Design a protein around this ligand. Structure first.
Ligand code: 6XX
Length: 130
């Protein structure tokens, strides 16, 4: 319906705003675009489903997220991929793991403060009716 399309449009606006705020944070530059395969040639082999913030924006625009829960699954994926691909105690690995956890924590904190629970519940109920 018109009510439901308006709901999902608002969801997309909200998700773009959150994602933009993550993307402009200097700490999260490494997560803004897909990896350069010349920098990490084995990434395609090691990481089952790559994810990055530009891909998240594309998915928002393709109407791939019908709830904030679905969106957070991809944010979680960005983080979990980083913990998986960079496991070692070397400072480089520790830096990116810290940034990955910070990205995840920042997204969840923004959502905690700014997402109305009744809006999310409406999204979830529309999604489950399809
Ligand atoms: C197995 O590879 C890792 C070996 N240890 C050092 C790691 O690099 C640490 C950098 C990563 C980039 C930074 F900004 F976060 C600062 C710490 C290695 N891991 C990775 N190395 C390089 C990249 C990368 C990919 N494309 C473009 C650029 C400029 C850099 C990445 C990217 C991702 C997403 C990742 O998880 N690990 C990387």
């Amino acid at each position: 319906s018109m009510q439901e399309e308006d709901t999902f449009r608002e969801l997309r606006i909200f998700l773009r705003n959150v994602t933009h705020r993550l993307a402009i944070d200097k700490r999260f530059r490494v997560f803004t675009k897909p990896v350069d395969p010349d920098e990490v040639p084995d990434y395609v082999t090691v990481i089952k489903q790559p994810m990055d913030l530009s891909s998240v924006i594309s998915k928002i625009d393709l109407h791939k997220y019908l709830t904030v829960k679905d969106y957070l699954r991809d944010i979680d994926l960005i983080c979990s991929n980083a913990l998986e691909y960079n496991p070692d105690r070397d400072p480089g690995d520790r830096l990116i793991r810290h940034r990955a956890c910070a990205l995840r924590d920042t997204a969840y904190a923004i959502i905690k403060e700014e997402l109305d629970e009744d809006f999310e519940q409406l999204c979830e109920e529309i999604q489950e009716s399809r």
